[PDB]
Design a protein around this ligand. Structure first.
Ligand SMILES: COC1=C(OC)C(=O)C(C/C=C(\C)CCC=C(C)C)=C(C)C1=O
Length: 183
């Protein structure tokens, strides 16, 4: 069973399938705002960057997931594993445990050395308050659910990376043809 997982993963079709998934989610939402005139927040962008970044990594790793490239693409996959998950909880703690508007919060201050936000404010500029609820499933906010899918992706890499057959293979199964004339 596991042996196949490494096979289905080493397949491009599968890789392309993972891309469409994150896309079907990023797009489906990009329409909800254009329909319900929703107002994105600072945190929302952070979440979008976490996945948006991974999405790319999936397209880069799918270039040769059979070569050392693994650790090369896993650089972004893992980075989001500990940091993405370690930061998500913090965001959930606030929502589940708010607090006076003392911390003070407003427009996000983009960096002056990373033209990634400044040169691209179209998908970085924040507008509204963070932690607000725009829509939920089964009574849960998107941020929470997305976290559910967020960990799944992180686990897929950890397993797809360790899949390394190491060196203790098996060559082939025992008893292939044996006694069977007419080849
Ligand atoms: C204000 O409206 C919203 C947006 O403006 C279009 C967003 O961009 C995003 C970010 C979208 C993400 C993280 C993926 C969507 C899928 C899930 C399961 C969250 C969210 C959450 C949102 O609420």
């Amino acid at each position: 069973m596991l042996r196949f997982l490494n096979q289905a993963s080493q397949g491009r079709g599968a890789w392309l399938l993972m891309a469409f998934t994150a896309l079907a989610l990023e797009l489906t939402a990009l329409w909800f705002q254009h329909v319900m005139l929703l107002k994105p927040c600072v945190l929302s962008i952070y979440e979008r960057a976490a996945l948006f970044g991974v999405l790319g990594a999936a397209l880069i790793g799918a270039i040769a997931p059979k070569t050392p490239l693994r650790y090369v693409a896993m650089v972004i996959w893992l980075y989001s594993a500990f940091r993405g998950v370690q930061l998500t909880y913090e965001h959930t703690m606030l929502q589940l445990y708010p607090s006076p508007f003392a911390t003070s919060d407003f427009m996000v201050r983009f960096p002056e050395w990373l033209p990634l936000d400044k040169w691209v404010p179209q998908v970085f500029v924040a507008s509204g308050d963070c932690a607000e609820r725009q829509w939920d499933f089964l009574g849960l906010e998107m941020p929470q659910w997305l976290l559910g899918i967020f960990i799944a992706y992180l686990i897929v890499a950890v397993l797809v990376v360790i899949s390394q057959p190491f060196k203790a293979k098996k060559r082939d199964l025992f008893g292939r043809g044996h006694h069977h004339h007419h080849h």
